[PDB]
PDB file of C-alpha atoms in Angstrom:
ATOM      1  CA  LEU N 554      81.447  98.550  78.346  1.00 49.33           C
ATOM      2  CA  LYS N 555      81.444  95.904  80.878  1.00 50.61           C
ATOM      3  CA  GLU N 556      85.211  95.699  80.722  1.00 53.55           C
ATOM      4  CA  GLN N 557      85.607  99.563  81.125  1.00 54.29           C
ATOM      5  CA  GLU N 558      83.345  99.607  84.275  1.00 56.51           C
ATOM      6  CA  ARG N 559      85.286  96.582  85.851  1.00 59.62           C
ATOM      7  CA  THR N 560      88.747  98.384  85.201  1.00 60.60           C
ATOM      8  CA  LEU N 561      87.377 101.719  86.956  1.00 57.37           C
ATOM      9  CA  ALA N 562      86.111  99.691  89.951  1.00 58.87           C
ATOM     10  CA  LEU N 563      89.531  97.901  90.573  1.00 57.59           C
ATOM     11  CA  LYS N 564      91.300 101.357  90.260  1.00 57.99           C
ATOM     12  CA  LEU N 565      89.012 102.891  92.830  1.00 62.47           C
ATOM     13  CA  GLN N 566      89.554  99.875  95.146  1.00 60.99           C
ATOM     14  CA  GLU N 567      93.445 100.212  95.013  1.00 63.38           C
ATOM     15  CA  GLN N 568      93.294 103.915  95.769  1.00 67.00           C
ATOM     16  CA  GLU N 569      91.047 103.410  98.777  1.00 67.88           C
ATOM     17  CA  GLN N 570      93.366 100.715 100.090  1.00 67.56           C
ATOM     18  CA  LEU N 571      96.518 102.965  99.759  1.00 68.99           C
ATOM     19  CA  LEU N 572      94.655 105.815 101.612  1.00 66.85           C
ATOM     20  CA  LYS N 573      93.742 103.465 104.429  1.00 66.70           C
ATOM     21  CA  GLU N 574      97.389 102.295 104.910  1.00 65.30           C
ATOM     22  CA  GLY N 575      98.717 105.752 104.965  1.00 66.77           C
ATOM     23  CA  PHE N 576      96.249 106.828 107.648  1.00 68.88           C
ATOM     24  CA  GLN N 577      97.153 103.750 109.837  1.00 68.89           C
ATOM     25  CA  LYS N 578     100.875 104.540 109.459  1.00 69.08           C
ATOM     26  CA  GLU N 579     100.295 108.231 110.676  1.00 70.73           C
ATOM     27  CA  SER N 580      98.106 107.027 113.591  1.00 69.48           C
ATOM     28  CA  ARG N 581     100.992 104.747 114.787  1.00 67.34           C
ATOM     29  CA  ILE N 582     103.470 107.597 114.564  1.00 66.20           C
ATOM     30  CA  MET N 583     101.221 109.928 116.594  1.00 68.56           C
ATOM     31  CA  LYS N 584     100.616 107.068 119.234  1.00 67.68           C
ATOM     32  CA  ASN N 585     104.350 106.588 119.682  1.00 71.46           C
ATOM     33  CA  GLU N 586     105.033 110.306 120.184  1.00 71.22           C
ATOM     34  CA  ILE N 587     102.276 110.438 122.785  1.00 71.52           C
ATOM     35  CA  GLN N 588     104.055 107.510 124.587  1.00 72.71           C
ATOM     36  CA  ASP N 589     107.388 109.066 124.369  1.00 72.79           C
ATOM     37  CA  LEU N 590     106.104 112.457 125.720  1.00 69.30           C
ATOM     38  CA  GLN N 591     104.675 110.671 128.771  1.00 66.44           C
ATOM     39  CA  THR N 592     107.892 109.118 129.876  1.00 65.06           C
ATOM     40  CA  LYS N 593     109.939 112.394 130.015  1.00 64.74           C
ATOM     41  CA  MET N 594     107.445 114.597 132.062  1.00 61.75           C
ATOM     42  CA  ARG N 595     107.953 112.709 135.424  1.00 58.70           C
ATOM     43  CA  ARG N 596     110.271 115.203 137.014  1.00 61.11           C
ATOM     44  CA  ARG N 597     109.321 118.369 139.020  1.00 62.59           C
ATOM     45  CA  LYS N 598     106.130 119.997 140.225  1.00 61.79           C
ATOM     46  CA  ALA N 599     102.468 120.779 139.916  1.00 63.19           C
ATOM     47  CA  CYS N 600     100.608 124.127 139.640  1.00 65.66           C
ATOM     48  CA  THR N 601      97.628 125.106 138.077  1.00 64.31           C
ATOM     49  CA  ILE N 602      95.356 126.861 135.749  1.00 67.07           C
TER      50      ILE N 602
END
């Protein structure tokens, strides 16, 4: 029983680590796209609402 519980806990920790790495990769992609959008909109004209 003690061996089975230990195996289950390791398997959960690996899944949690993988999910965290994916989320950090997606957040970096989005941050890069925001930076690239900000460099291209520096030509021509303001108005309004």
